């Protein structure tokens, strides 16, 4: 069945990544994550910011580059 014919989830994810990455550093850090949390205005308790980064790869990168963010998004590949 046809749904998304476009490729531009990569564009979405890239421009989303840049809305976290203020620093233009190529990483979403904990700080960038919490800076996003206070931009939405959601009163998160630091530990779930830690969970979100810990989820998005302490195995290889440590904090979150675009491939880790792509991995965290592509986790929903019908899931």
């Amino acid at each position: 069945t046809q749904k998304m014919s476009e490729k531009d989830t990569k564009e979405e994810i890239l421009k989303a990544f840049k809305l976290f990455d203020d620093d233009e550093t190529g990483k979403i850090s904990f700080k960038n994550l919490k800076r996003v949390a206070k931009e939405l205005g959601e009163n998160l308790t630091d530990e779930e910011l830690q969970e979100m980064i810990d989820e998005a790869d302490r195995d290889g990168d440590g904090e979150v580059s675009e491939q880790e963010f792509l991995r965290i998004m592509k986790k929903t590949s019908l899931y």
Partner: peptide, 20 residues
């Protein structure tokens, strides 16, 4: 649900898809 007048919101889509 980010339907009418997309001034901002859609950082929510990125953040909330990660946390929730």
């Amino acid at each position: 649900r980010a339907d009418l007048h997309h001034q901002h919101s859609v950082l929510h889509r990125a953040l909330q898809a990660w946390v929730t």
